[PDB]
């Protein structure tokens, strides 16, 4: 059924979001970051204020 297809799509997205929630945050979301922790020249790409 179409509803069932929606359910597979949703369950895939829930698996992705659960994995993302478990995963350690990106360096930008760690609060304090030193040059060693983050990739070298990571701030070059990113836009920071």
């Amino acid at each position: 059924s179409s509803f069932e297809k929606q359910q597979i799509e949703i369950r895939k997205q829930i698996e992705q979001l659960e994995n993302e929630a478990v995963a350690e945050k990106k360096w930008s979301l760690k609060g304090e970051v030193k040059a060693k922790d983050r990739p070298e020249d990571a701030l070059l790409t990113e836009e920071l204020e």
Partner: peptide, 21 residues
């Protein structure tokens, strides 16, 4: 090898900065 990687990082920096402007 390391020099080429540094060059590639410089190219990425340059193209991103170009996209900004």
């Amino acid at each position: 090898t390391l020099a080429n990687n540094v060059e590639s990082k410089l190219r990425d920096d340059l193209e991103r900065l170009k996209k900004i402007r």
